[PDB]
Amino acid sequence: KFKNSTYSRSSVDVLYTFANCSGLDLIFGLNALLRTADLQWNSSNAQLLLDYCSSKGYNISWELGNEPNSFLKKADIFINGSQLGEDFIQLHKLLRKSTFKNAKLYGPDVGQPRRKTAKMLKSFLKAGGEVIDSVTWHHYYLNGRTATREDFLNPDVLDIFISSVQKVFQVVESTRPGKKVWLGETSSAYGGGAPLLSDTFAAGFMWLDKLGLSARMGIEVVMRQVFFGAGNYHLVDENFDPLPDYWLSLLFKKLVGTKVLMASVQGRRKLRVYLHCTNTDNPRYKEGDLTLYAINLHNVTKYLRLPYPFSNKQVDKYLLRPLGPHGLLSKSVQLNGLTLKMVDDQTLPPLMEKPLRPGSSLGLPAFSYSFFVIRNAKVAACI
Amino acid sequence: QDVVDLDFFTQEPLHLVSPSFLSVTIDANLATDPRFLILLGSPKLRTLARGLSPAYLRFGGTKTDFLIFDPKKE
Ligand SMILES: Cc1cc(=O)oc2cc(O[C@@H]3O[C@H](C(=O)O)[C@@H](O[C@H]4O[C@H](COS(=O)(=O)O)[C@@H](O)[C@H](O)[C@H]4NS(=O)(=O)O)[C@H](O)[C@H]3O)ccc12
Ligand SMILES: *[C@@H]1O[C@H](CO)[C@@H](O)[C@H](O)[C@H]1NC(C)=O
User: Fold this and answer.
1) Within A218-340, where are the H helices?
2) B7 annotated ligand-binding residue
3) A111 Cβ inside 6 Å of ligand 1
4) Catalytic residue status for A287
5) What's the CA gap between A168 and A135, in Å, rounded?
6) Residue A220 falls in the annotated catalytic set
7) Is B38's Cβ below 8 Å from some Cβ in A?
8) Which burial class, exposed, middle or buried, applies to A137 when counting CB atoms under 10 A from its CB (0-12, 13-18, 19+)?
9) Across the interface, do B24 and A361 touch by the CB < 8 Å criterion?
10) A226: closest CA among B38, B35, B17, B31?
11) B35 touches chain A (CB under 8 A)
12) Burial class (CB in 10 A: 0-12, 13-18, 19+), A294
């Protein structure tokens, strides 16, 4: 079904320029199904492409293969983790030989545990574990073909991700303790997303919960399938218009700091809470400030009371709600009742907070998600 | 009733995420689109991408292991 396919120097330059000019760090997957006779990896094609990028002054990190677990299904070849481990050492040698010897290497981009991936990853990390700067794995909650609206709003679906992550950390801790763990490709639903679901406000429960849980459980980097493309899980549509997950992804970057803390509800399935230090790059916010974010999957509004000593602090609300009439199936979203649109092709809107009456409880409508910045929190940890 | 009390842990960072914590992919599938050049050229799309800096852009997917570099190809 899947056939080999060539790509030009122009393809590479296009892709490099897009990243460089957008301020993003390109990671390039190399063809790991190029095999020598002895079923080892053939590096010559990859060798051509290292040579070209090095000649051009291209700062790029590298991967080798995507979901080796199913090379047997995809191309009638089984590659064991040990060999894929050896194949990664071969490639790491070439990067050390090459002009960017400090070049970072990520792998092996295996699917989630439920796809019978544990052995392959453990064998891979025992063998190749030393040369890779992060372990990459993939997660999708659902099949795009069968995913329902109810699936997207189901806390029992969101919770299976917790076990996926615990299982990955179990393999890694038994092989390369303290190695960084990255979600290398992840979204709502495989097969290119759930039509009229993966591209809506409804996709945001799964995206924001994945982000909260990944941060809480020790995932360092989450790579969203996809920024742009054919799949319904794209952040940007085919007309280059941002979908609700774009605005969510932007508001997360503005408000959420790198320092992960914890929140919990005293009652804990349909009210999902996450706490980090505020991103202080926002001139509005200073060190010690907290960013709370919350998902409400109840069908009624909930009123969150801040714990002592934060009950009386000034809180900025960033509440995200669909623009009607399609409700959770809408491709448009309002921040605090104002529709989020590009001001023009050059210009993102401001993201206006809504300051709350100090000492008021935090209102979170049914089927919504919100950020709350607790100003003058003065959390020493947030320094 | 619909009033919920939160508990916070604020003693120390439990984890440190990369500044590029929220990163993004382009699927390898997209390098097999005729319109590829046009799409990544979009200055609108670049406005949108810049708003996500800092982040990794991962180029990969099923086609990763079905793409062959041609230094002779256009
Ligand atoms: C069986 C299964 C379970 C699972 O949890 O994850 C999977 C991920 C899979 O594949 C992985 O997840 C994605 C997905 O599928 O959505 C694929 O996406 C591309 O390829 C898909 C074809 O899948 S494939 O069978 O031909 O590989 C297209 O439907 C999709 O639109 C396209 N992304 S796009 O941006 O270009 O639109 C990825 O390339 C691939 O790494 C494949 C199977 C599974
Ligand atoms: C919420 O869900 C329950 C299902 O048990 C339903 O019977 C109830 O009337 C719903 N409430 C609202 C406000 O829609």
Assistant:
1) 244-255
2) no
3) yes
4) no
5) 10
6) no
7) no
8) buried
9) no
10) B31
11) no
12) buried
Token pair belonging to B31: 């390098």
A186 is in an annotated binding site: no
Sequence-ordered list of residues with C-beta below 8 angstroms from that of B67, at least 6 positions apart, any chain: A4, A5, A6, A7, A31, B28, B31
List phi, psi (to 5°) of A76: 60, 30
For domain A9-260, which CATH number applies: 3.40.190.10, 3.20.20.80, 3.40.50.1820, 3.90.190.20?
3.20.20.80
Is residue A357 within 8 A of residue A262, CB to CB? The reply is no
Torsion of CA A109, A129, A51, B42, to 10 degrees: 30
Distance between CA B61 and CA A4 in Å, rounded? Answer: 14
Q: What is the DSSP letter of A364?
A: E
Q: Is B70 on the interface with A (CB under 8 A)?
A: yes
Chain B contacts in chain A segment 205-224 (CB below 8 A): 211, 214-216, 218-224
The structure tokens listed for A68 are 């080796």
Query: CB of A43 within 8 A of CB of A89?
Result: no
Q: Do B15 and A215 touch (CB under 8 A)?
A: yes
- Whether residues A229 and B57 touch (CB distance < 8 A) is answered with no
Contact A9, A55 (CB under 8 A): no
CB contact A173 to B (< 8 Å): no
DSSP conformation letters of B26-51 = EEGGGGG-TTHHHHHH-HHHHHHHHT
Across the interface, of B52, B62, B66, the residue whose CB is closest to A253 is B52
What whole-number distance in Å separates Cα of residue A105 and Cα of residue B30?
23
How far from chain centre, in Å, is Cα A94?
Answer: 29
CA A40 to CA A352: how far, in whole Å?
55
CA A37 to chain centre: 37
Q: Provide the token pair at A222.
A: 């989450």
**B57–A23 CB contact, under 8 Å:** no
Selected residue of A222, A232, A266, A291 to mutate for chain B interface (largest B Cβ count, 10 A)? A222
Domain segments of chain B as ranges: 1-74
